[PDB]
Design a protein around this ligand. Sequence first.
Ligand SMILES: [Co+2]
Length: 53
Amino acid sequence: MKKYTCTVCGYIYNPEDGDPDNGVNPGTDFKDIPDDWVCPLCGVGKDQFEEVE
Ligand SMILES: [Co+2]
């Protein structure tokens, strides 16, 4: 699975780690994260993220 970065603040979503404090368990692909989730650091929505390639 691919890493995704927040293009506003630089937070990296790592699917191996998830974001468990906000209910995103380890092993969750970015596409499967609920669409109301926001960047844990800067608070922007998923639409400001992009695949790290
Ligand atoms: Co951010």
